From Swiss-Prot, chain C:
Subcellular location: Cytoplasm
Biological role stated in the UniProt entry: Component of the ribosome, a large ribonucleoprotein complex responsible for the synthesis of proteins in the cell. The small ribosomal subunit (SSU) binds messenger RNAs (mRNAs) and translates the encoded message by selecting cognate aminoacyl-transfer RNA (tRNA) molecules. The large subunit (LSU) contains the ribosomal catalytic site termed the peptidyl transferase center (PTC), which catalyzes the formation of peptide bonds, thereby polymerizing the amino acids delivered by tRNAs into a polypeptide chain.
Note in the entry: Present with 30900 molecules/cell in log phase SD medium. There are 2 genes for eS17 in yeast.
Similarity comment text for this entry: Belongs to the eukaryotic ribosomal protein eS17 family.
Protein known as: Small ribosomal subunit protein eS17A
Subunit structure: Component of the small ribosomal subunit (SSU). Mature yeast ribosomes consist of a small (40S) and a large (60S) subunit. The 40S small subunit contains 1 molecule of ribosomal RNA (18S rRNA) and 33 different proteins (encoded by 57 genes). The large 60S subunit contains 3 rRNA molecules (25S, 5.8S and 5S rRNA) and 46 different proteins (encoded by 81 genes).
Whole-protein coverage range: 2 to 62 of 136
Domain of life: Eukaryota
Curated annotation (Swiss-Prot), chain D:
Gene3D superfamilies linked: 30s Ribosomal Protein S14, Chain N (4.10.830.10)
Any GO MF annotation of the entry: zinc ion binding
Residues that, per the record, bind Zn(2+): C18, C21, C36, C39
Lineage: Eukaryota, Fungi, Dikarya, Ascomycota, Saccharomycotina
UniProt family annotation: Belongs to the universal ribosomal protein uS14 family.
The name this protein goes by in its record: Small ribosomal subunit protein uS14A
Source organism of this protein record: Saccharomyces cerevisiae (strain ATCC 204508 / S288c)
Misc. remarks from the entry: Present with 6490 molecules/cell in log phase SD medium.
Swiss-Prot record, chain F:
GO biological process, one term: cytoplasmic translation
Gene name tied to this protein: RPS20
GO cellular component: cytoplasm; cytosol; cytosolic small ribosomal subunit
Main subcellular location: cytoplasm
Keyword Ubl conjugation: yes
The organism's taxonomic lineage, starting at the top: Eukaryota, Fungi, Dikarya, Ascomycota, Saccharomycotina
Protein's UniProt name: Small ribosomal subunit protein uS10
One GO MF term: mRNA binding
From Swiss-Prot, chain I:
Protein name: Small ribosomal subunit protein uS13A
GO molecular function terms attached to this record: rRNA binding; structural constituent of ribosome
Maturation and modification: N-terminally acetylated by acetyltransferase NatA.
Superkingdom of the organism of origin: Eukaryota
Organism: Saccharomyces cerevisiae (strain ATCC 204508 / S288c) (Baker's yeast)
Residues bearing PTM N-acetylserine: S1
Keyword set includes Nucleotide-binding: no
Keyword flag rRNA-binding: yes
Pfam families per UniProt: Ribosomal_S13 (PF00416)
Residue ranges the record marks as coiled coil: none
Name of the gene encoding the protein in the UniProt record: RPS18A
RNA sequence: UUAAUUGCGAUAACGAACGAGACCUUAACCUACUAAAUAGUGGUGCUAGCAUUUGCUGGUUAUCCACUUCUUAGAGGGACUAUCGGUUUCAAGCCGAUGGAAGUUUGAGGCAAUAACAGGUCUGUGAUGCCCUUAGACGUUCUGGGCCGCACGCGCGCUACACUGACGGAGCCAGCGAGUCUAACCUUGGCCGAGAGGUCUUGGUAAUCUUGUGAAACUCCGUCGUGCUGGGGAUAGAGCAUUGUAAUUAUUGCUCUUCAACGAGGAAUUCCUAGUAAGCGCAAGUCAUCAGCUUGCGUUGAUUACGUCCCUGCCCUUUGUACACAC
């Protein structure tokens, strides 16, 4: 038919793309996966432990598909959140820049996101076709 | 799932069974205090009935393992069948008895 | 409250003083006619002046 | 001498003064006005600043 | 160079600085107001006053001096700003002129009652619909009391007071 | 040559007729052009206490000023930059001729 | 100073943290009689701690008896499926 | 020149434009199908204009809606208002009144908010309090 | 179903690093009782020890607690970041250390006494009992004596 | 009767003036006008992915064409309670139903009369009378402290006292507003670092670039469990950076660790009638750096009145007074 990444729910697609990233870990595995806190606002490291890197990669790649150009600061602002500064009220805090940098470069190594003009990154031509093929799969898994 | 009738029917009969019919009012006028019983309008009966059910389940869910979902369900079901364990039913008894004594 | 100010009250009576047939028994038709007759600097003011005038046009009937 | 005014006033309230009375404390540096607030009220309707709402 | 928001804030400050300088210097000349007209390269600043002959003064040296005075203050270039001198119309309806005139009468030693009622009579005989002057301070004693001389009617609230009344 | 007439002022009426005069000079002769583009008004707002001292109930103020910006886009050779350059300037509004 | 408030909880009856055998026969023969079952129901009547109902509620849902009438955010409503 | 109409809608500050042209029955918002809302509870609230009258009138139209502004519920209220006005607009350039007038009567017979936008808007904050009516805590002694 | 039975190896209480470690709770949080170990450090120790995070303290094989214990007393040897320690660049030697249950409190007294003996501002205020980080004390810190 | 000495009307009073009202701004409406790559929309070309069967989702300023519904405005329109049915000398008007975007003077503000305080300010003023003072000056300036100092008592505020929760993942939507020239601001993007932050550059004098400010509260998956506990983060110890000539009685930011009171708060008391309260964050002001403050903006959005003078106060009239600095 005409299904695509926009013809799918967010939770199912990200888990499905995480599923089709753990089974063969082609992308990468950074050495400091188990010690990052994802931000200076978050108080605890992610409880996914073994994964959480292809889960972010799945979310980042899906975010790239619907947009044209982003940046590491843009990912930091999007993936950040409120920080409990003790008795002081909450405040928005950007995410960890190194984590999004490693994910973004990792997506470049496989061939799913590459650099774009006017700055920033952009979904890859091989990246667009495989990501769309994911959507054709996750819909028919429930069917 | 529990008490298998139409839940909307259960809601409407519960509020009609926990709405106070008589109530007391301030009449202190001049002299420390003093109560005096009056009646309750149908609109106030519904408003009081809803308020009593909400506060009862909210208080019973305070520092308790039971979630507000089952606490609301238990409060409405018990008030629907007119049992004494309901917070709203007990409160209706208090207001009616107070008004009856100060009649 | 909808109590009309004396400014719109006196002017409306003066309008009917010399213009019986001009102010028709309807509001919209003579609302612009009041503007053509009197120098009114506010659209709101002439709207209320015509409203009282039309109401007075109905009462005299 | 070289000790009269050796202190570096370029990063604080002592580095900025009003163009009318050179008054300290509260000033209006917004849009580069560099005027203190209380005489700004007196000369408000000279710069084009009016009050409708 | 300068953004539009800062540019228009600066020219109003330029107007404020120029107006106060003229008020403090040409106070005895019956100064009323100023219009700051800007045009590319050359700009003209029209000065309104009653004693326009003294405003220019002695062949025009004073007005040339005033042009040279604002020259060095505002950091312009030779021939960029020219000072004009336009006679004030309806001098009886300019509160700035009457306020200065009352100040000189009080400074000279003229009676407050005669001066205050003299100026208000001059105002409405010029074609005004109302005027009001307030004199406050230590008069006739140490304790300060305010005096109010008025005639006619004066609206006090709304848009029209700013549109009509000059204070 | 992409002459653009930029007008900024605080008085809407005086800026309107300047654009009207510029656009009326434009629609004369031939001068195919683009009409007045209505940029959003820049509303400055400085909020200040009314009290010069510190005593008194908290009563704030707001001294606002509106800037109306409209640009006029022309397109013609030198035979109108001998003609458009004749500024129709009223007190207040200003003009900045920008080509390309 | 003075507080004008009470300071006491009750008596914490701490119970199973790891599922045992003598109550494994209990659960398999006692929850299929629950007209309404959820996380809190067997916490009170069956006296089960925190991280055992969620496994037990996942236990029978995947295996047998009770069925997903409405399993959702922070509320797993199941019936006496028969 | 293919058949098409356009509308608009607001809730508090959002906007939603429905370019309802002639199609095979595609209802999409920001490139996603209508079944993917976000509150997942007001999905039937945006499903409303689909189900008051029936799906037969929706079989020859495709409503494409782009939304900007407001909260998640405000976006939902923008979508339902836009598609409801989009349906009448398609009936207000091609189809007869009996199709439209009972369409446009039944929509308001259930709720006026489907076509008529909410007139209430946020009120400006006044000095002396965190909000318009609210004031700071004053005390004596 | 992820249901398993118990045979009797569960111990209701533990004792690591000369302190009481209560069971009945997850291992990542049952190790927070040790004076000088928090939620993040306990998570790091458990992660590198491969102790199946979703495991109660009692339901832990003894061969894994020693591996956890050895990481506690020598974190830098087991690839732990140098920036994940409480005592960094010690004033005595400079090697990155990590104080433990009894070391956390004892080492705290030594540095205050070192501060006190040198007659520094922080040392004297610590002896006095007032704030040492510059907080206001006019309206705060009252119910202390 | 009205929010209103606002009107009907009565009448030794007539004619009037100020205030109120009127007026101005803003928030709402305009598929009617003027328009517009510094805002967009649709279409024609170039081009990508899925299915190819007919399509869907996209990218693309020199690929051009057409339009102004949404985006901004300028000139204007619209709202007067319109009609009907009741109530009223049957007048002012009031109430209910009969259009609307708007029927509590459409909502909210601005402006805001006479008289007065023996109200606040000589520490805003190169506005100030008088007194003190003017060279070991009470002037200016330099260096270091101080305004933060705590036995204690009060007033505004921020965190909470956990399941309508906390934590970890995802979805993840706004508005107001600001921003560098002979300076060094807002900073996009790439690289380095767990982070703070650093680094090489880019865009912007501004609807154009920061920025679609991808904000938070919010929702869906999981972790947890009724546990002074995964609630809560005061109190401290160590380390890493930023701002400055200088940070020591830590400016602030980041990391680890220590994990105290607090289990809904007593006499008493504060604010509030709709997008309002409340919850939530953002911008601006002070600013080299520092928000728990203030001024504005938007997000989610209740219950409860449509009344009273009982308490605390106000306006008019009658009445009484040994009060006049006036209970």
């Amino acid at each position: 038919p005409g299904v695509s990444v926009r013809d799918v729910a967010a939770q199912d697609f990200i888990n499905a793309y995480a599923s089709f990233l753990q089974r063969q870990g082609k992308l990468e595995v950074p050495g400091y996966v188990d010690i990052v806190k994802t931000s200076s606002g978050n108080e605890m490291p992610p409880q996914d432990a073994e994964g959480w890197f292809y889960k972010r990669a799945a979310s980042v790649a899906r975010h790239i598909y619907m947009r044209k150009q982003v940046g590491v600061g843009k990912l930091n602002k999007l993936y950040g959140g409120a920080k409990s500064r003790g008795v002081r009220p909450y405040k928005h805090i950007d995410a960890s820049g190194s984590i999004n940098r490693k994910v973004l470069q990792a997506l470049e190594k496989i061939g799913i996101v590459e650099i774009s003009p006017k700055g920033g990154r952009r979904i890859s031509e091989n990246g667009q076709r495989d990501l769309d093929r994911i959507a054709a799969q996750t819909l028919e898994e429930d069917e | 799932v529990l008490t298998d009738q139409n839940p909307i029917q259960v809601v409407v009969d519960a509020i009609t069974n926990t709405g106070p019919r008589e109530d007391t009012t301030r009449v202190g006028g001049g002299g420390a205090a003093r109560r005096q019983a009056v009646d309750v309008s149908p609109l106030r009966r519904v408003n009081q009935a809803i308020a009593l059910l909400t506060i009862g389940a909210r208080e019973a869910a305070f520092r308790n393992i039971k979630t507000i979902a089952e606490t609301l369900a238990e409060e409405l079901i018990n008030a629907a069948k007119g049992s004494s364990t309901s917070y709203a039913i007990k409160k209706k008894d208090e207001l009616e008895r107070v008004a009856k004594s100060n009649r | 409250g909808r109590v009309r100010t004396k400014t719109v009250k006196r002017a409306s009576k003066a309008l009917i003083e010399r213009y019986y047939p001009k102010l028709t028994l309807d509001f919209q038709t003579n609302k612009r006619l009041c503007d053509e007759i009197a120098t009114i600097q506010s659209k709101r003011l002439r709207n209320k002046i015509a409203g009282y005038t039309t109401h007075l046009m109905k009462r005299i009937q | 001498e070289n000790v009269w005014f050796s202190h570096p006033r370029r990063y604080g309230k002592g580095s900025r003064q009003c163009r009318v009375c050179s008054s300290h404390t509260g000033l209006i540096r917004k849009y580069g006005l560099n005027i203190c607030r209380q005489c700004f009220r007196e000369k408000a309707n000279d710069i084009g600043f009016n009050k409708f709402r | 160079l300068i953004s539009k928001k800062r540019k228009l804030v600066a020219d109003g400050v330029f107007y404020a600085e120029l107006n106060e300088f003229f008020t403090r210097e040409l106070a005895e000349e019956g100064y009323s107001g100023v219009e700051v007209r800007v045009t590319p390269t050359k700009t003209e600043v029209i000065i309104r006053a009653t004693r326009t002959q003294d405003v220019l003064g002695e062949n025009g040296r004073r007005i040339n001096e005033l042009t040279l005075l604002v020259q060095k203050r505002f950091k312009y270039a030779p021939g960029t700003i020219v000072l004009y001198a336009e006679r004030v119309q309806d001098r009886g309806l300019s509160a700035v002129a009457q306020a200065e005139s009352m100040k000189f009468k009080l400074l000279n030693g003229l009676a407050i009652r005669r001066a205050a009622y003299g100026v208000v009579r001059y105002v409405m005989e010029s074609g005004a619909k109302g005027c009001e002057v307030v004199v406050s301070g230590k008069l006739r004693a140490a304790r300060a009391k305010a005096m109010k001389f008025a005639d006619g009617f004066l609206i006090h609230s709304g848009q029209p007071v700013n549109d009509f009344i000059d204070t | 040559i992409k002459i653009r007439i930029t007008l900024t002022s605080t008085k809407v009426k005086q800026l309107e007729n300047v654009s009207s005069n510029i656009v009326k000079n434009a629609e004369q002769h031939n001068l195919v052009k683009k009409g007045p583009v209505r940029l959003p008004t820049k509303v400055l707002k400085i909020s200040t206490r009314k009290t010069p001292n510190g005593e008194g109930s908290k009563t704030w103020e707001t001294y606002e000023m509106r800037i109306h910006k409209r640009y006029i886009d022309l397109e013609a050779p030198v035979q109108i930059v001998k003609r458009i350059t004749q500024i129709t300037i009223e007190p207040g509004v200003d003009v900045e001729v920008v080509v390309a | 100073k003075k507080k004008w408030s009470k300071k006491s909880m009750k008596d914490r009856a701490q119970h199973a943290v790891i599922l045992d055998q003598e109550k494994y026969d209990r659960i398999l023969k006692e929850v299929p009689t629950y007209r309404y079952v959820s996380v809190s129901v067997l916490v009170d009547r069956l006296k089960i701690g925190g991280s055992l109902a969620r496994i037990a509620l996942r236990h029978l849902e995947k295996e047998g008896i009770i069925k997903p009438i409405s399993k959702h955010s922070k509320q797993a409503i199941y019936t006496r499926a028969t | 020149a293919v058949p098409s109409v356009q509308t608009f809608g607001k809730k508090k500050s959002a906007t939603a434009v429905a370019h309802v042209k002639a199609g095979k029955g595609l209802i999409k918002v920001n490139g996603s199908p209508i079944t993917l809302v976000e509150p997942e509870i007001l999905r039937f609230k945006v499903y409303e204009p689909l189900l008051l009258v029936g799906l037969d009138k929706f079989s020859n139209i495709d409503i494409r809606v782009r939304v900007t502004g407001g909260g998640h519920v405000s976006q939902v209220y923008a979508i339902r208002q836009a598609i409801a006005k989009g349906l009448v607009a398609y009936h207000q350039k091609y189809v007869d009144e009996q199709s439209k007038n009972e369409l446009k009567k039944a929509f308001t017979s259930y709720d006026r908010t489907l076509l008529i936008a909410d007139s209430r808007r946020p009120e400006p904050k006044k000095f002396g309090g965190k909000g318009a009516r609210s004031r700071f805590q004053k005390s004596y002694r | 179903s992820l249901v398993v039975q118990e045979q009797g190896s569960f111990q209701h209480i533990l004792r690591l690093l000369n302190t009481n470690v209560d069971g009945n709770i997850k291992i990542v949080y049952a190790l927070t009782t040790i004076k000088g170990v928090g939620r993040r450090y306990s998570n790091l120790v458990c992660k590198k020890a491969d102790v199946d995070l979703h495991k109660r303290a009692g339901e832990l094989t003894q061969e894994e607690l020693e591996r956890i214990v050895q990481i506690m007393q020598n974190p830098t040897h087991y690839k732990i970041p140098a920036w994940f320690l409480n005592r960094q660049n010690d004033i005595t030697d400079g090697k990155d250390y990590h104080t433990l249950a009894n070391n956390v409190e004892s080492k705290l007294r030594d540095d205050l006494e070192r501060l006190k003996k040198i007659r520094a501002h922080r040392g004297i205020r610590h002896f006095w009992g007032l704030r040492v980080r510059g907080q206001h004390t006019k309206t705060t810190g009252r119910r202390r004596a």
